C-alpha cells in the first residue's frame, strides 16, 4: 500500500480513499514522505532513491492553477493533447514507427489551443462519452504574462541547489500534465532526473528500482515504446513475462504541494485517482551527471541498463536494420550462454 | 561422403578405404579436387570457398620428410607435443584458463626435442600403450640447414601470388603437424586464411561454412576453447545443441601433395585416418584482408560472426568480469527478443 490517506487540514477529511486506486498483482511498500529539511530526505536524493518532499514550495504559485485560470493566461500556443479510448496512455515515439509498421498505437496526438482542450473536455463530460484526453506539453515562451510570473515564482533557489549538489546537467524542460480522472501512464523509465511537482488532484505513483529490469520487460530499444514495460499491468502475461511475478513496487499518492523525486532509470507507473477530478502536474527534467572518471566494480544496475541500451543501439546500426538485432542476440546466446 | 578413394599411380591400389573413417551423425558432400590451373579453383578461392588443389607443388621438397629425416635435420629447438588419453585433441588457450578454473583439459602440452618426440612415440608403440601424441609446432629459425633449404624450395611463387590477388595480409606462421593414426582435431574455426599442405599420410577434413554458426555452438569467447565447437561429434547432445541436427559438412581426404584451402571463419574437423600411420602436415596461416571501406548490406555470415565476437569481448571488458557476460545477455533477450 501507499500509506494511510493523509487527513487534510481544517478537518476536511481524507483527501482520498483506497477505493480510488486501481487493483494490481504485486505488493508495494510506501515511499517516505518527509520535510525537505529532513536529513533523511537529502540522504535519499543523494543515493538516487525516491522521496516525497511535502514542503518545498517548488510550484507554490501554480497551486492556484485550474482550467479557467490557465485558459485565461497560458496564451495561444499549441498544446499536445493525447486522445485514447482506454485509460492507458502508453508513450510511444512517433519517429520509430517506421521501424515497426505493425505497431498500431492506442493513443493519438492532436495539437490544439488550450481553450479547445477545455471545450473538448467539456464536450466529453456532457455527453458522458468514454473518450479520454491527456494534455502533455512542455512549457515554452508562448505562455502569457501571468504564467511567466508564476513560473518565475517557483522555488528556483531550492531546486538550483539540488542540481548543483547532485552534479546534474541542465534543466531540459518542464512538462505540463493535465489528465482526466482514471488516466494511467504505464510503467516506464526515463533517462533524466525528475522532480515531479503535483498541483491539482491526486496521482498514485508506483516506482520500481533499476534492478527490476528483469521483471519489467522493456520493449526493444528500436521499438516506438522504448523504455516502456511490455507487461499489461491489468492482465499480466506470466508465460511471456514470468519474472513479473517477482516485481515489488514503492508506492505513494501525491497531492497539491507535494514533490516526488523520481530518480533517473527508476521505473514509474502513474495514475490519476479514480473519481478524483482532473489532475495537474509540472515536472522538472534534468540531465544526469556524467559518467565518472573512474569506474567502480561491480557495476550498478543503472550502469548495466546503460550498457544494454548501447549494445542494442550499436547492433541496430552495425547490422543495418533494427529487426536483425533479436536474431543476432539469440544466435549469440542459444546453447552458448543460456 | 568424401568421394571415391583415389587410386594411386603404378596400380598401387586405393590409398585408403572408408573403413578408416570415423562415423558421425551428419551428411556431407565432397570438396572439389581440382588442378591449380583450373579456373574453377580460382573461382572457389576468390569466393572464400574450400577447394583441394592437387598439383601446386607447394611443399614439394617436404614430400620426402619422415621422422628419420626430420630428426636428423630439424635441429635442437623445442617442439610443443600434446599428450592425451583420448583421440580428441581439443584446442584450448592456456592464457584463458584463469577465467574458467573448473575447466580441466584432456590434453597437456610438453616441450621436448624432436628426438625425444620420436623416442616417446616408439615407447608407446612398443608397449601397446593408449597414450596419444600430437606434435604441433610453428617452424622457426632453429631448424637445421637441410630444412631451411627445403622450406626455401616451397612454391613461394604460387602462394605469394595468391596472397597478393586475394588482398591478404602477412604470412604469420607455418605450423608443423605430426599426428598419430586416429588423432582428431575437433571442429573449430580460425581467424586467418589457411593453405593446408599435406605431406605424409592421409587426413579426413570436414568443413562447415560460417553460416552454420547456429548449428555448431562455439564456446564463449572468454572460455579457453574459444572458436571450438562445444558439440561432442562422437556423442552429440541434441537437447543442448538442437541445431546440430541440421549441420551439413563439406568433406575430403587429403594425401601427400594435396593442398586444401580452408577459408577464414570456416569450421573444420580434421582426423588422421584410422590405421593409416603417422601424418605430417604444414599449414600456411595468412591474416585476412582488411574490412572494406564501404560496407554492403545485408552483411555476410562471417561479418556477423566478427560482430558477435566483438560484442562478447566488449561486454567482458565493460562488465569487469567475463562471467557476467552470459547473465547480461540473457537479461537483454528474455521476454524482449526471444
Amino acid at each position: 500500500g501507499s500509506g494511510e490517506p493523509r487527513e487534510e487540514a481544517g478537518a476536511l477529511g481524507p483527501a482520498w480513499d483506497e477505493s480510488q486506486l486501481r487493483s494490481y498483482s504485486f505488493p508495494t511498500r510506501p515511499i517516505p514522505r518527509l520535510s525537505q529539511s529532513d536529513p533523511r530526505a537529502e540522504e535519499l536524493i543523494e543515493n538516487e532513491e525516491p522521496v516525497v518532499l511535502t514542503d518545498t514550495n517548488l510550484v507554490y504559485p501554480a497551486l492556484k492553477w485550474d482550467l479557467e485560470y490557465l485558459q485565461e493566461n497560458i496564451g495561444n500556443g499549441d498544446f499536445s493533447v493525447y486522445s485514447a479510448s482506454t485509460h492507458k496512455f502508453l508513450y510511444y515515439d512517433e519517429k520509430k514507427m517506421a521501424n515497426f509498421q505493425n505497431f498500431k498505437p492506442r493513443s493519438n496526438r492532436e495539437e490544439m489551443k488550450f481553450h479547445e482542450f477545455v471545450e473538448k473536455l467539456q464536450d466529453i463530460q456532457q455527453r458522458g462519452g468514454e473518450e479520454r484526453l491527456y494534455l502533455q506539453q512542455t512549457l515554452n515562451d508562448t505562455v502569457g504574462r501571468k504564467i511567466v510570473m508564476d513560473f518565475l515564482g517557483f522555488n528556483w533557489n531550492w531546486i538550483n541547489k539540488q542540481q548543483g549538489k547532485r552534479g546534474w546537467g541542465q534543466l531540459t524542460s518542464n512538462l505540463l500534465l493535465i489528465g482526466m480522472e482514471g488516466n494511467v501512464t504505464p510503467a516506464h523509465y526515463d533517462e533524466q532526473q525528475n522532480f515531479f511537482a503535483q498541483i491539482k488532484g491526486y496521482k498514485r505513483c508506483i516506482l520500481f528500482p533499476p534492478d527490476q529490469f528483469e521483471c519489467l520487460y522493456p520493449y526493444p530499444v528500436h521499438h516506438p515504446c522504448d523504455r516502456q514495460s511490455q507487461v499489461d499491468f491489468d492482465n499480466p502475461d506470466y508465460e511471456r513475462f514470468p519474472n513479473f511475478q517477482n516485481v515489488v513496487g514503492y508506492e505513494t499518492v501525491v497531492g497539491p504541494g507535494d514533490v516526488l523525486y523520481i530518480p533517473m532509470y527508476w521505473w514509474h507507473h502513474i495514475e490519476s485517482l479514480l473519481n478524483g477530478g482532473i489532475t495537474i502536474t509540472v515536472n522538472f527534467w534534468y540531465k544526469g551527471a556524467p559518467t565518472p572518471k573512474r569506474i567502480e566494480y561491480p557495476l550498478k544496475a543503472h550502469q548495466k541498463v546503460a550498457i544494454m541500451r548501447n549494445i542494442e543501439k550499436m547492433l541496430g546500426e552495425a547490422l543495418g536494420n533494427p529487426q536483425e538485432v533479436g536474431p543476432l542476440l539469440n544466435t549469440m546466446i542459444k546453447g552458448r550462454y543460456n | 561422403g568424401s568421394g571415391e578413394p583415389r587410386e594411386e599411380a603404378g596400380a598401387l591400389g586405393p590409398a585408403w578405404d572408408e573403413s578408416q573413417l570415423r562415423s558421425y551423425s551428419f551428411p556431407t558432400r565432397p570438396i572439389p579436387r581440382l588442378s591449380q590451373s583450373d579456373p574453377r579453383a580460382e573461382e572457389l578461392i576468390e569466393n572464400e570457398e574450400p577447394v583441394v588443389l592437387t598439383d601446386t607443388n607447394l611443399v614439394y621438397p617436404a614430400l620426402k620428410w619422415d621422422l628419420e629425416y626430420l630428426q636428423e635435420n630439424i635441429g635442437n629447438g623445442d617442439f610443443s607435443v600434446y599428450s592425451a588419453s583420448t583421440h580428441k585433441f581439443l584446442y584450448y588457450d592456456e592464457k584463458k584458463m584463469a577465467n574458467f578454473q573448473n575447466f580441466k583439459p584432456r590434453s597437456n602440452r610438453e616441450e621436448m626435442k624432436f628426438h625425444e618426440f620420436v623416442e616417446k612415440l616408439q615407447d608407446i608403440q612398443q608397449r601397446g600403450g593408449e597414450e596419444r601424441l600430437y606434435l604441433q609446432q610453428t617452424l622457426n629459425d632453429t631448424v637445421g640447414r637441410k630444412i631451411v633449404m627445403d622450406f626455401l624450395g616451397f612454391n613461394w611463387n604460387w602462394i605469394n601470388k595468391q596472397q597478393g590477388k586475394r588482398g591478404w595480409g602477412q604470412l604469420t606462421s607455418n605450423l608443423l603437424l605430426i599426428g598419430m593414426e586416429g588423432n582428431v582435431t575437433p571442429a573449430h574455426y580460425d581467424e586467418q586464411q589457411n593453405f593446408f599442405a599435406q605431406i605424409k599420410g592421409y587426413k579426413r577434413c570436414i568443413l562447415f561454412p560460417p553460416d552454420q554458426f547456429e548449428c555448431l555452438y562455439p564456446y564463449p569467447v572468454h572460455h579457453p576453447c574459444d572458436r571450438q565447437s562445444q558439440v561432442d561429434f562422437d556423442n552429440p547432445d541434441y537437447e543442448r545443441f538442437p541445431n546440430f541436427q541440421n549441420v551439413v559438412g563439406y568433406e575430403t581426404v587429403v594425401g601427400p601433395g594435396d593442398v586444401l584451402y580452408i577459408p577464414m571463419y570456416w569450421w573444420h574437423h580434421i582426423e588422421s585416418l584410422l590405421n593409416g600411420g603417422i601424418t605430417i602436415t604444414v599449414n600456411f596461416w595468412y591474416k585476412g584482408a582488411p574490412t572494406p571501406k564501404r560496407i554492403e548490406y545485408p552483411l555476410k555470415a562471417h561479418q556477423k560472426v566478427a560482430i558477435m565476437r566483438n560484442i562478447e569481448k566488449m561486454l567482458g571488458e565493460a562488465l569487469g568480469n567475463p562471467q557476467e557476460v552470459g547473465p547480461l545477455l540473457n537479461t537483454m533477450i528474455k521476454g524482449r527478443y526471444n
Binding site: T172, S173, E191, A306 | -
Partner: peptide, 18 residues
C-alpha cells in the same frame, strides 16, 4: 574507451520530439 562508450547514458524522456 570502449568501457566509457558502453556506459554512456542517453537522455530520452516521454516527450515527443518534433
Amino acid at each position: 574507451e570502449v568501457v566509457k562508450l558502453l556506459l554512456e547514458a542517453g537522455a530520452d524522456v516521454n516527450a515527443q520530439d518534433k
